[PDB]
Design a protein around this ligand. Sequence first.
Ligand SMILES: *C\C=C(C)/C=C/C=C(C)/C=C/C1=C(C)CCCC1(C)C
Ligand SMILES: CCCCCCCC/C=C\CCCCCCCC(=O)O
Ligand SMILES: CCCCCCCC/C=C\CCCCCCCC(=O)O
Ligand SMILES: [Cl-]
Ligand SMILES: [Cl-]
Length: 264
Amino acid sequence: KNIESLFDYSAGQFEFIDHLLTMGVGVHFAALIFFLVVSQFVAPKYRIATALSCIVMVSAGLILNSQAVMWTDAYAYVDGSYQLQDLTFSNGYRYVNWMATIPCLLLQLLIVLNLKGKELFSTATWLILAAWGMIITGYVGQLYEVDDIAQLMIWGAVSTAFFVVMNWIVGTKIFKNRATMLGGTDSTITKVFWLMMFAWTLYPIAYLVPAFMNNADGVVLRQLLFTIADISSKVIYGLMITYIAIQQSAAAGYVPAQQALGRI
Ligand SMILES: *C\C=C(C)/C=C/C=C(C)/C=C/C1=C(C)CCCC1(C)C
Ligand SMILES: CCCCCCCC/C=C\CCCCCCCC(=O)O
Ligand SMILES: CCCCCCCC/C=C\CCCCCCCC(=O)O
Ligand SMILES: [Cl-]
Ligand SMILES: [Cl-]
């Protein structure tokens, strides 16, 4: 049902996808340890933001590790190339977590934006329904990434509609709550928004490879496209969200944040 199952892979393509995925686990899980140790320097009101990154980290990494083992389970070197065996590989598992890490990333965004109470809950609900819409329509579309390209685009189209609306909610909330943010992070939060827009656009592009490059190299380009999109939407966005939390913590009087920031 997926383009990965259509081709045999050179040893170079197979080894490179395996190393991509394994490199991914390493980063997600090495970042994991960073978000853990620095959480003590984050004020109570922001510490959930760092913790959500830990959840994102382990959510992504467990998936990535699962994909790497499934990659090696599904193919074997036969007659000079890596060929599909009795198990299959697919990316659909990667949408399911997206269902999960995105609430979390939106939520740590909203926390450092100093949203609170009912506006936090009402904003989070709308975002999660809209991010969820993007993901699930997108997921139905790549189900047809072999059998029905026309239904690829239409679902991709529907998902893309959801995408635009979420980034409208996210954008509106950043620029209206820019003013509440402490220690100069009002300048920082706008870079975050643009960082997010870059790596979140990488995924549709990845989604569309079967339509414009339906061959084994396009299978590689996806997994490459996925790796950058993830490193940036999870790991780098995490780190940036964390610097904001610590900086606002220091500006709010949290002495462990003032000391950690001063230590460097
Ligand atoms: C792991 C974290 C994040 C933020 C991943 C996000 C994924 C997307 C923004 C992908 C969206 C899609 C679009 C807009 C249209 C086709 C279907 C996709 C799911 C690939
Ligand atoms: C900031 C995002 C970081 C992404 C790091 C991804 C690592 C990949 C680096 C470049 C790969 C270039 C090597 C070419 C692959 C050879 C493909 C083949 O064997 O046919
Ligand atoms: C298993 C994969 C092989 C590579 C091993 C993992 C290497 C991890 C590489 C560097 C991690 C960089 C992520 C940032 C760590 C937090 C500290 C910081 O940069 O602020
Ligand atoms: Cl506090
Ligand atoms: Cl994830």
